[PDB]
């Protein structure tokens, strides 16, 4: 099922930092941090990364449980914010859920944390 995910997109974001791509990613975990800002652990099938943050405008996707752990989604707009220590935060501005958590059912592949 790893052929469904954009393998290498996490490395591309962390290296090139370009925002033109529209990667297909699996949500591994979603945690509110505090009004809530949701932090996501995402997988591209090869790697995971936990510095994804949901824009507030997308909170209804979490609240209505369309975006939830194990769902597959496609990012349509995101912003990269590189911190002074070199880590990158990825703010998801627009996305579409392609396959529900219930329909996927399980973590895809055996992704390992990026670097």
């Amino acid at each position: 099922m790893v052929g469904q995910l954009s393998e290498g997109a996490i490395a591309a974001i962390m290296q090139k930092g370009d925002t033109n791509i529209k990667p297909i990613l699996q949500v591994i975990n979603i945690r509110p941090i505090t009004p809530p800002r949701y932090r996501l652990l995402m997988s591209d099938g090869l790697n995971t990364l936990s510095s994804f943050m949901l824009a507030t405008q997308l909170n209804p996707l979490v609240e209505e449980e369309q975006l939830s752990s194990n769902c597959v989604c496609q990012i349509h707009r995101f912003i990269v914010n590189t911190l002074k220590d070199g880590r990158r935060v990825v703010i998801l501005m627009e996305l579409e859920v392609l396959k529900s958590a219930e329909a996927v059912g399980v973590k895809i592949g055996n992704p390992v944390p990026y670097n």
Partner: peptide
């Protein structure tokens, strides 16, 4: 380099400003 803890959570929250 990213963890489930208050300092990282707060840095991530602030980065969305």
């Amino acid at each position: 380099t990213w963890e489930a803890d208050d300092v990282d959570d707060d840095l991530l929250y602030q980065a969305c400003d």
